[PDB]
Amino acid sequence: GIRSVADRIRVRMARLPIEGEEGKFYTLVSYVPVASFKGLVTKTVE
Amino acid sequence: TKGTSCRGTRHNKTHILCKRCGKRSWHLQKQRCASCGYPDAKMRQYAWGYKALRRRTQGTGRMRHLKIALKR
Amino acid sequence: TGHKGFSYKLKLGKKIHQNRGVPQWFRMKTGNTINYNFKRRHWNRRKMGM
Amino acid sequence: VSLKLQKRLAASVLKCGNRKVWLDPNETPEISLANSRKAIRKLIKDRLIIKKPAAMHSRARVVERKQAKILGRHTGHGKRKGTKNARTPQKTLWIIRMRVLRRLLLKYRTTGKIDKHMYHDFYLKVKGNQYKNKKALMESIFKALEEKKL
RNA sequence: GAUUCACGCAGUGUUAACGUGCAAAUUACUUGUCAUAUUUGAGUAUAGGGGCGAAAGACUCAUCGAACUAUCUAGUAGCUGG
RNA sequence: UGAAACUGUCCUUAGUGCAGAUCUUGGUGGUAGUAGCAAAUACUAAGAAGAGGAAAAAAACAUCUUAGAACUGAAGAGGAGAAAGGUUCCUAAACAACAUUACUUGGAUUAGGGUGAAUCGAUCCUAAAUUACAGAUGGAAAUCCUUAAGAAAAGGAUUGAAAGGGAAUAAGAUUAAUAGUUCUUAAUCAAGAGAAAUGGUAACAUAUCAUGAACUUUAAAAUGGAGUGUGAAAAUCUACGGAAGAGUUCUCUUUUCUUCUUAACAAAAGUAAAUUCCACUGAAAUGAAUCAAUCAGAGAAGUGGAAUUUAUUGGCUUUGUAAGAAAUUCAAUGAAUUGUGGUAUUUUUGCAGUCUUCAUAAAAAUUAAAGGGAAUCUUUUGCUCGUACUAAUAACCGCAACAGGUCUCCAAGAAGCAAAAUCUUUAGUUAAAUAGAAUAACGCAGGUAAGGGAAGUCGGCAACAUAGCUCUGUAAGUUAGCAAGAAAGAGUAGCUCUGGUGAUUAUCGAAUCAGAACUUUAAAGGUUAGGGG
RNA sequence: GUCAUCUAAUUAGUGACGCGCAUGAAUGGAUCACCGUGAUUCCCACUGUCCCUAUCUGCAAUCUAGUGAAACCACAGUCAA
RNA sequence: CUGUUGCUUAUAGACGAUGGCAUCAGAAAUCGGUGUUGUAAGCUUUAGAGUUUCUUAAUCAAUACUCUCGGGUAUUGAAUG
């Protein structure tokens, strides 16, 4: 609902080229569901 | 409540269009026209209402036949 | 109202017919000052009182 | 574009509300050409316009509470909010009881257990609130009969 | 023409809000009342020294200890202003 | 600068000189980019269209679709009418102005389209009341009279209701918008055209039958309210049996949800409740019956009959209409299914008796019957007018898209005594006088607080406090009816069980009451909900 | 007003007294049971009314983008005598 | 040099201002410390008052035992790396 959000959220954002203009980029934030947040650090997904 | 609130029920016409003068002055319950003095045979005219005379009288309309006769 | 007399309905129709602007060709006449109809009205602006 | 006309026309054809109408978001150009009910009827056949299912409203919780109330699991003193006469009307209890007792008396008279004279006496006793229930009347009738035969 | 709740309605209090307002009298809570002396729609009747009033000089189109509108009328002013 | 009239002197004439009149009319400042653009819970992501989200976060972005999250909560922010409005209705193009920002949106601009009736209403009848010729009155305008005054009208003239009376139509489909109005199918009504009957003891009964004038009478149209019981239909709930589809499914769930329908008008397999009458008989040892009553020798109860009412024929199931429609699925137009019940609740509609009035709770048009005996199936047509839309937190009245006001119909689940508060389904909407950041004072709205407890104050103003149901208990005073829910005290949860209250003749069914072990965070209190003396 | 009572304390309330400025009998006199969004006093309970203020939330106010009035105004705006 | 700007910056603050750092900058996770509440979800204790179907097998069952000093939260204006 509008009155509550999860205490911690794990997301993954990817920088991708804009289809129209080749020069510019855009960020796509996606949601990564995890069972527990213990021992998770900032990982560069490749 | 003599001001804004009391004007809610104003949805019953008192005067409707008259048949001899065409104005919305025919009193429904009184069965008379307040302006041209309907069924009364004579047109209702008063000397205190000098303006009401110059608003509807001879020469304020088409004068369909009288214009021919006087010019004749 | 949904219910109306025949004569009253026709007088309603004329008021609809008279609520029109000046045709374009009449506006191009030489020495023409009649550009807009100042007798115009709209339902939500002035009640025609009939 | 504005698919307001197609949203309204689809509901009229599908006989639902505008809330249940589904318009394909990928086929906006196709639906936009549909400006008539005949065209809309063609789109439904092609499944571009779909009638959404009604929201599910389950009575499982209500049913399982009724069975608990049948066994008396929730009919306590802290769960009653109306008066005794409100919950069980006293007049209707008398109406039911009068029908029950008078039915039995009529059955005994026509069967032959009791004659008209003793039936008449028991009729006024019943009306006078002498017997609590059906059981109380049968022993009272049985007692009177054996006294008569004694 | 008993006691209460509800749909509604009123206007006891906060002398609360607002007071160049949502509103030329309204809003919130509290209070009262909520079918027979009840509530209510349409039709109809009663007109200004008149009507109507379970009576407050109250109401009679935001106008009432005498409505609105026009004529007498540029009413008169030993009084104020220019 | 301006581009066509004007000036100097003498007499004459006057609408002849402005800083004020809260002067009149018009225009314009400071205040001032200030006060404001804060009731109605609320928006977010992706995409489309567009000049109209750009960017060193310019943190906000109108319309449409999808998804998420929500509100009105079925006495509605739903679906429709009366009045009032009058084209605001539908569509397309277009956004200069208007809806306190903006708008590609609009109840705003421009141009087109749109209202179909023999059966719905007006039209017909009369109510309160209203208005004529003649007559009477008046100086006059005019007033009175409404059948009394009349050489007028068998008997009394006009108007007065889109809520009173009233001949006759329904289901499905169709339009961008009209539909008891159009189309398909199926009906109904009115006006027209082609010495005179039987049956039953009786109440009374017979696809038109089976004659019935003048005149007269009776009835219908056409009659308050309250409360109780009950018949039937619909909705909701539920029992058994299924068919199709959908949701959940690593934890379970033979699972949870949806569909399983039927009109006007007629028919008469089967079968009801209530009331009133008819025949046989004659009741006391008085009986018959209702929740209550109430009834009987001017005749009870019993048995056998007749009639009327129960949303059209004749009330319900059933039948024709009619499954060929419609609903739910499946395949790519064609295929499948469409049982039977309930001693449950509400609503609607009738019926039966009871209570109440110093209240007795309309008329006519129009129809039928009687008393009397004067006379000797097919087919045609059905005219005039209204019909769009809102009916309101944006179409009505208040200067307006104003938190004010304005008459009605239909009405799901939970929980509860309750149409109460609170939450949800069908439907509607997420916008309704702009937002973003920061989180000072002073506010408006909602709160809490140690110890004390009205010492504050004109005054317990405001707020706190009591609050449902069951049981025990209840004073003085009194018009003997009341006070009284007086006051005061105890109980209340969850789970596992036990017993009482019936129907039918072993099977089935109802929520209601009482009682007992065990457990815990020890129980009306989320909401609703008396402070007492 | 005087005497009692209510309180620690009573121009308040209640019960009495009465030569009552100027009460009094359908201008109705005396009496009160039930009733009252009527006026007045006292108890219990409860509490931010108060000792004596602290603190929490929403909407504003503050700043900004867009939009944007009004009352008022002789000229104006530091004091003492 | 100074100001703007950045740390959605603090020992500051209505806005300005004031204070600190600005590539050995900053920000964020995670980990440890430190707090708050009271023993997570799944399975097991004739647990468990009793019931049913069996015919000592199961099933239902408020609550309750061990795993569990557990689980969850913890700067947002907390302290380390």
Cα(D101)–Cα(D133) distance, rounded to whole angstroms? 8
Bridge pairing between strands A25-31 and D49-51: unpaired
D126, D134 Cβ separation under 8 angstroms: no
Against chain B, the chains showing at least 3 CB pairs within 8 Å are C
Nearest nt to the A37 alpha carbon by C1':
H30
Pure H helices in chain B: 50-55, 66-71
Q: What angle is formed at CA D111 by the lines to CA D105 and CA D115, rounded to 5 degrees?
A: 65
**What H or E segment, with its residue span, contains residue C24?**
helix C24-27
D116-127 and D134-149 helices, crossing angle to 10°: 140
Q: Name the method of structure determination.
A: cryo-EM
Residue C43 makes CB contacts below 8 A (sequence gap 6+) with none
Residues in Cβ contact with D31 at an 8 Å cutoff, skipping those fewer than 6 apart: D3, D6, D23, D24, D43, D48, D49
Distance, in Å, from the CA atom of C19 to the CA atom of D121, rounded to the nearest integer, reads 92
What is the DSSP pairing of strand D49-51 with strand D21-23?
A: antiparallel
- The answer to whether D21 and D51 have CB atoms below 8 angstroms apart is yes
Rounded to a whole number of angstroms, the distance from the CA of C8 to the nearest CA of chain B is 9
Is D125 (CB) below 7 Å from strand F? no
Place of tokens 């409100």: D86
Distance (Å) from the C-alpha of residue B13 to the closest C-alpha of chain C? 10
Answer yes or no: do B24 and C11 touch at CB < 8 A. no
Asked whether strand H has any atom less than 7 Å from the CB of A42, the reply is: yes
Contact yes or no for D23/D7 (Cβ under 8 A): yes
CA distance C36 to chain B (A): 25
Residues of B in contact with C12 (CB under 8 A): none
- D30 contact partners, CB below 8 Å, separation of at least 6: D24, D43, D48
- In terms of C-beta density within 10 A (0-12 exposed, 13-18 middle, 19 or more buried), how is residue D31 classed? buried
Amino acid at the residue B65: H
Burial label for D113, CB within 10 Å (0-12, 13-18, 19+), is middle
Three-state helix/strand/coil letters over D76-103: CCCCCCCCHHHHCCHHHHHHHHHHHHHH
CA separation for the pair A14, A27 (Å, rounded)? 6
Residue whose structure tokens are 């029109």: C20
Alpha carbon separation from D139 to B2, B57, D131, D134, D146 (Å, rounded):
78, 107, 10, 9, 11
Chain F positions with a protein C-beta closer than 7 Å: 42-43, 46-49, 63-67, 69-70, 81-88, 90-92, 105-111, 121, 130-131, 142, 162, 174-177, 228-230, 237-238, 246-247, 255-258, 285-293, 327-328, 332, 384-391, 395-401, 404-406, 413-418, 424-429, 468-471, 491-504, 511-515, 523-525
Tokens of A7: 């205490």
**Which residues make Cβ contacts (< 8 Å) with residue C48, sequence separation at least 6?**
C15, C41
Kindly determine whether residue C11 and residue B17, on different chains, have CB atoms separated by under 8 Å: yes
Mention every residue, 6+ apart, whose C-beta is less than 8 A from residue C37.
Answer: C20, C21, C22
User: Distance, angstroms, CA B66 to C1' F157?
Assistant: 40
Distance CA B33, CA B18 (A): 7
Q: From the CB of residue D27, how many other CB atoms can be counted at a distance below 10 Å?
A: 14
Q: Is the separation of the CB atoms in D141 and D112 below 8 Å?
A: no
Helix (H) or strand (E) holding B16: strand B15-16
Q: Residue D60 corresponds to which tokens in the numbers above?
A: 């499982």
**Strand pairing report for D21-23 and B15-16:** unpaired
CB < 7 A to strand F: residues 5-44, chain D: 5, 7-9, 11-13, 15-25, 28, 35-38, 41
**A12-15 long-range CB contacts below 8 Å, 24 or more apart?**
A12/A45, A14/A45
Whole-angstrom CA distances from A14 to A8, A30, A44, D85, D89 are 20, 8, 10, 71, 72
Q: What DSSP string runs through chain D?
A: ---HHHHHHHHHHHTS-TTTEEE-GGGHHHHHT--SHHHHHHHHHTTSEEEPPPPP---HHHHHHHHHHHTTSS-SSTT--S-HHHHS-HHHHHHHHHHHHHHHHHHHHHHTSS-HHHHHHHHHHHHTT--SSHHHHHHHHHHHHHHHH-
Beta bridge partners of A26: A16
